[PDB]
């Protein structure tokens, strides 16, 4: 592998959801650890699959992997990091001062800004602090889908700029934040990210046009930020030998070859590596030790997705949130549902809270009765700033208004603006269908505001029912959990369902999308994949889900109104 030659200290793995970031990260960390180096595999994804891949319980603590010596693992959980940050800030001042002031500080540190800054502080502490990670020669960062990994990588520069612009009194974080001490750490993280000799950025993708476009956009933005040298990995390439004497495999191979030959011009210069498709899930050391190296070489009748759309229509109005793991087909299924509902003569609003929206790509047309929209972080941040200035800024004097605007310029207000837009869009589901494609599980769970941190942060600025009061009502919401027939996707879907039920939301249905089992595959590799997928399909049908639909692996990517509406009614 080209990206494994003379690796720098750090190695990020960024790309669209479900492209193989975690699999490649684990394989590379295992390879380096076996080579003799001491590696630390950090997972910045809030919903990390590292523990499920290695079969070890990994939390917000550096836990060695017993199976492979010299390798340690870490998962940056935002909640645990926020709790540790709050403890560090409050415990030293507890007892000395009365309970009133200390509890006030605790309440002021209980917002979403505190969680975000705690996770970011842990990330930059890993990046910069040499003593903390001196024992590890390599740190392998396995990131979430690029929609939020780009934000994470931009956060050091944004915070350094905010602090260097004479802004040390962000009232969102509270007076006890003391960000002035972390200015040097933020600048060091920025320098490390922009130094090709210290950090290597690997852009994982697939032989699909959407993933390659996403990686091209990510490469453009990250090159703008300051990362110089980047590599490219194309995961999940069907071997050419499988395309013989098989319609589905031949179509997939033709599409993937066409995608490779039309790689974006910006990514044509990056050093490229190709990882084939394997007849097994990449879970465990046995499967992970043969991921980066080329391998030396069913009658399923499940419920369709038409029943789900019929049930959704029967209500006549409400919200339909397509949650699930990244890369499972949330956008495609949301677009298909919206297109089918609009084609029936009903008013539909199709929205996407993903910071990297892919709605206009999967729709490609202005359908009748369908209103497409997205939660653009920058526009929402603007709108939030003007709203706060108009509401609260009227009373303040000129100097107070300027100070309030400088406070609102802090990077963390973007997430509160996004939450405000999300709540406003949800409030529109009382009279018309609102199909909301979501981001991956890790950040969507934070967006739902189960703990009320976002609501507290909003009402602190003083600029009405919470979103949870609607997602908890089965009569005006439907949370469809989209998963694949694979091990890790089903495990993460079950974890998402458990979290939702803990929060009070009962998912309406499950969708096993792009299952080779549903389709008829004759190549040995795809037959092995279907055989492996049968067990997960059975698990989802019997245990996890009482209402579900199975969508096969279409031989042509569903794009446009016609293809999107075809998978609803095969
Ligand atoms: N039934 C299907 N048959 C074949 N390909 C499919 C099918 N459903 C989805 N795909 C492919 O899955 C790819 C994944 O992109 P998609 O937007 O659907 O996923 P997502 O879960 O929204 O991703 P992200 O986590 O990156 O936001 C799409 O490019 C589409 O080509
Ligand atoms: N080369 C490959 N061959 C076969 N299966 C693969 C390959 N690469 C990845 N997979 C499968 O992809 C599934 C999802 O990949 P992975 O766990 O790497 O997701 P991810 O990129 O971390 O996504 P997310 O951002 O949604 O967490 C895994 O179950 C693994 O089985
Ligand atoms: As803030
Ligand atoms: Mg991952
Ligand atoms: Mg999507």
Provide the residues around ligand 4 (an ion) whose CB is within 5 A: 21-22
State how far the Cα of 514 lies from the Cα of 303, in Å rounded to an integer: 14
Radius of gyration of the chain (CA): 24
What is the maximum alpha-carbon separation in the chain? 78
State how far the Cα of 353 lies from the Cα of 357, in Å rounded to an integer: 8
Closest CA to 147 of 226, 227, 211, 207: 211
Q: Give residue 257 CA to ligand 1 midpoint distance, Å.
A: 18
State how far the Cα of 265 lies from the Cα of 352, in Å rounded to an integer: 28
Q: What tokens were used for 379?
A: 């526009």
CATH topology agreement for domains 8-288 and 306-568? yes
State how far the Cα of 425 lies from the Cα of 221, in Å rounded to an integer: 28
Query: Is there a catalytic annotation at residue 18?
Result: yes
Given 15, 20, 393, 442, which residue is catalytic? 20
Instruction: Give the distance, in angstroms, between the CA of residue 130 and the centroid of all CA atoms in the same chain.
Output: 29
Contacts of 270 (CB under 8 A, 6+ apart): 203, 219, 230, 231, 232
Instruction: Give the distance, in angstroms, between the CA of residue 187 and the centroid of all CA atoms in the same chain.
Output: 26
Q: Which atom of ligand 1 is nearest to the CA of 211?
A: 29
Instruction: Give the distance, in angstroms, between the CA of residue 374 and the centroid of all CA atoms in the same chain.
Output: 16
Beta strands in 343-483 (DSSP E): 348-352, 370-372, 433-437, 477-483
State how far the Cα of 188 lies from the Cα of 183, in Å rounded to an integer: 9
State how far the Cα of 428 lies from the Cα of 203, in Å rounded to an integer: 37
363 with 560: CB under 8 angstroms? yes
- The CB-side HSE value for 354 (13 A sphere, CA atoms) comes to 31
Closest CA to 72 of 111, 102, 121, 32: 32
Tell me which residue has tokens 């960024």. 14
Q: Is 560 left (phi over 0), alpha (psi -120 to 50) or beta?
A: left
Contacts of 138 (CB under 8 A, 6+ apart): 7, 9, 10, 11, 29, 32, 37, 38, 39, 40
Instruction: Give the distance, in angstroms, between the CA of residue 199 and the centroid of all CA atoms in the same chain.
Output: 22
Tell me which residue has tokens 């941040």. 381
Instruction: Give the distance, in angstroms, between the CA of residue 348 and the centroid of all CA atoms in the same chain.
Output: 25
Q: What tokens were used for 393?
A: 């800024």
State how far the Cα of 211 lies from the Cα of 511, in Å rounded to an integer: 21
Q: Positive or negative CA dihedral for 330, 333, 335, 338?
A: negative
State how far the Cα of 199 lies from the Cα of 123, in Å rounded to an integer: 14
Q: Return the exposure string of 245-270: e unless at least 16 CB atoms fall within 10 Å of the residue's CB, then b.
A: ebebbbebbebbeebeeebeeebeeb
Residues paired with residue 348 on neighbouring β-strands, in sequence order: 370, 433
Q: Look at ligand 1, atom 31, and give the residue with the nearest C-alpha.
A: 557
Give the DSSP letter of residue 468: H
Q: Identify the residues whose C-beta falls under 6 Å from ligand 1.
A: 16-18, 145, 208, 210, 326-332, 354, 358, 440, 513-514, 551, 553-554, 557-558, 567
564 with 335: CB under 8 angstroms? yes
List the CATH code of the domain at 306-568: 3.40.50.300
C-alpha distances in angstroms, 101 versus 94, 173, 455? 9, 16, 22
- The CB-side HSE value for 21 (13 A sphere, CA atoms) comes to 30
Q: Specify the pairing of strand 477-483 against strand 433-437.
A: unpaired
Gaps in the chain (C to N distance exceeding 2.5 A) after: 297, 463
139 with 133: CB under 8 angstroms? yes
State how far the Cα of 207 lies from the Cα of 230, in Å rounded to an integer: 18
Tell me which residue has tokens 């027939």. 485
State how far the Cα of 236 lies from the Cα of 330, in Å rounded to an integer: 19
Residues paired with residue 447 on neighbouring β-strands, in sequence order: none
- Alpha helix positions (H), 245-397: 247-261, 285-288, 306-315, 330-343, 359-363, 377-391
Give the DSSP letter of residue 73: E
State how far the Cα of 481 lies from the Cα of 405, in Å rounded to an integer: 40
Q: First-to-last CA distance in the chain?
A: 41
Q: State which approach was used to obtain the coordinates.
A: cryo-EM
Contacts of 386 (CB under 8 A, 6+ apart): none
List the CATH code of the domain at 8-288: 3.40.50.300
Q: Give residue 547 CA to ligand 2 midpoint distance, Å.
A: 26
Q: Concatenated DSSP letters for 505-555?
A: ----EEEEEEETTTS---SHHHHHHHHHHHHHHHHIIIII-SSEEEEE--S
State how far the Cα of 53 lies from the Cα of 283, in Å rounded to an integer: 4
State how far the Cα of 445 lies from the Cα of 47, in Å rounded to an integer: 10
Q: Which atom of ligand 2 is nearest to the CA of 45?
A: 27
**Three-state SS annotation for 235-287:** EEECCHHHHCCCHHHHHHHHHHHHHHHCCCHHHCCCCEEEEECCCCCCCCHHH
335 with 359: CB under 8 angstroms? yes
474 with 508: CB under 8 angstroms? yes
Task: Establish whether residue 177 lines the binding site of ligand 3, counting it when its CB lies within 6 angstroms of any ligand atom.
Answer: no
C-alpha distances in angstroms, 361 versus 100, 149, 213, 345, 356? 53, 21, 10, 23, 11
Closest CA to 21 of 53, 60, 58: 53
Tell me which residue has tokens 């750090």. 10
Q: What share of the chain is helix, strand, coil (3-state, %, to 5)?
A: 50, 15, 35
Given 488, 514, 515, 523, which residue is catalytic? 488
Instruction: Give the distance, in angstroms, between the CA of residue 196 and the centroid of all CA atoms in the same chain.
Output: 26
Contacts of 240 (CB under 8 A, 6+ apart): 253
State how far the Cα of 340 lies from the Cα of 476, in Å rounded to an integer: 19
Give the DSSP letter of residue 451: S
Domain ranges (residues) in the chain: 8-288, 306-568
Tell me which residue has tokens 């049930």. 311
Q: Is 200 helix (H, G, I), strand (E, B) or coil?
A: strand
Burial of 361 (0-12, 13-18, 19+ CB in 10 A): middle
Contacts of 178 (CB under 8 A, 6+ apart): none
Q: What tokens were used for 58?
A: 């990994």
Q: What tokens were used for 471?
A: 């997602």
Q: What tokens were used for 361?
A: 């790509």
502 with 540: CB under 8 angstroms? no
Task: Establish whether residue 147 lines the binding site of ligand 2, counting it when its CB lies within 6 angstroms of any ligand atom.
Answer: no
Given 15, 28, 43, 45, which residue is catalytic? 45
State how far the Cα of 511 lies from the Cα of 328, in Å rounded to an integer: 9
C-alpha distances in angstroms, 70 versus 34, 42, 64, 351? 8, 14, 8, 46
Find the ligand nearest to 332 CA.
1
Give the DSSP letter of residue 299: -
450 with 468: CB under 8 angstroms? yes
Closest CA to 549 of 505, 522, 514, 499: 514
Task: Establish whether residue 145 lines the binding site of ligand 2, counting it when its CB lies within 6 angstroms of any ligand atom.
Answer: yes
* Residues annotated in a binding site: 16-23, 142, 206, 235, 276, 278, 282, 325-332, 437, 486, 488, 513, 552, 554, 557
Tell me which residue has tokens 């993280």. 189
7 with 200: CB under 8 angstroms? yes
Q: Specify the pairing of strand 433-437 against strand 370-372.
A: unpaired
* Residues annotated in a binding site for ATP: 16-18, 20-23, 206, 235, 276, 278, 282, 325-332, 486, 513, 552, 554, 557
């Amino acid at each position: 592998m080209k990206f494994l030659q003379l690796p720098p200290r750090f190695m990020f793995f960024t790309g669209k959801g479900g492209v193989g970031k975690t699999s490649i990260a684990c394989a590379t960390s295992i390879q380096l650890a076996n080579a003799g180096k001491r590696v630390l595999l950090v997972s910045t994804d809030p919903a990390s699959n590292v523990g499920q891949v290695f079969g070890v319980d990994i939390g917000n603590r550096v836990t060695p992997i017993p199976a492979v010596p010299h390798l340690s693992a870490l998962e940056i959980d935002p909640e645990a990091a926020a709790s540790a940050y709050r403890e560090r800030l409050v415990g030293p001042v507890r007892g000395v001062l009365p309970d009133d002031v200390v509890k006030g500080i605790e309440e002021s540190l209980s917002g979403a800004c505190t969680t975000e800054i705690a996770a970011f502080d842990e990330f930059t502490a890993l990046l910069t602090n040499a003593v903390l990670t001196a024992d590890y020669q390599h740190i392998i960062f396995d990131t979430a889908p690029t929609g939020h990994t780009i934000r994470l990588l931009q956060l050091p520069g944004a915070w350094s700029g905010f602090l260097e612009a004479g802004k040390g009194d962000a009232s969102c974080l509270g007076p006890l934040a003391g960000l002035e001490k972390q200015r040097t750490q933020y600048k060091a993280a920025v320098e490390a990210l922009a130094d090709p000799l210290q950090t290597r950025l690997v852009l994982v993708a697939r032989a699909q046009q959407a993933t390659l476009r996403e990686v091209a956009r990510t490469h453009e933005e990250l090159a703008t930020i300051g990362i110089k040298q980047q590599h490219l990995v194309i995961n999940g390439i069907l071997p050419s030998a499988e395309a013989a004497n098989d319609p589905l495999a031949a179509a997939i191979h033709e599409r993937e070859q066409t995608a490779l030959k039309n790689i974006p011009a910006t990514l044509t210069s990056l050093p490229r590596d190709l990882v084939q498709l394997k007849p097994f899930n990449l879970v465990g050391l046995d499967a992970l030790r043969q991921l980066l190296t080329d391998l030396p070489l069913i009658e399923l009748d499940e419920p369709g997705m038409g029943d789900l759309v019929d049930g959704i229509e029967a209500d006549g109005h409400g919200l339909v949130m397509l949650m699930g793991k990244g890369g499972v087909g949330k956008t495609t299924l949301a677009a298909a549902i919206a297109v089918e509902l609009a084609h029936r003569g009903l008013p539909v609003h199709l929205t996407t809270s993903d910071p990297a929206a892919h709605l206009t790509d999967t729709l490609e047309a202005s359908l009748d009765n369908l209103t497409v929209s997205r939660i653009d972080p920058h526009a929402e941040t603007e709108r939030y700033r003007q709203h706060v200035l108009e509401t609260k800024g009227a009373q303040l004097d000129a100097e107070g208004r300027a100070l309030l605007e400088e406070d609102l310029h802090s990077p963390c207000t973007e997430e509160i603006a996004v939450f405000q837009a999300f709540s406003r869009i949800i409030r529109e589901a009382g009279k018309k269908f609102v199909v909301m494609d979501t981001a991956p599980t890790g950040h969507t769970l934070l967006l739902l505001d189960a703990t009320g941190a976002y609501h507290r942060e909003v009402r602190r600025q003083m600029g009405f029912t919470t979103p949870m009061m609607q997602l908890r009502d089965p009569n005006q919401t439907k949370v469809l959990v989209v998963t694949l027939a694979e091990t890790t996707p089903v495990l993460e879907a079950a974890k998402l369902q458990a979290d939702l039920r803990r929060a009070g939301i009962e998912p309406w249905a499950w969708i096993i999308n792009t299952s080779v089992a549903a389709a008829s595959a004759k190549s040995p590799l795809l037959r092995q994949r279907a055989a492996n997928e049968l067990r997960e399909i059975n698990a989802v049908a019997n245990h996890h889900a009482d209402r579900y639909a199975v969508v096969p692996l279409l031989k042509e990517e569903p794009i446009g109104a016609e293809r999107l509406r075809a998978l609803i009614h095969p």
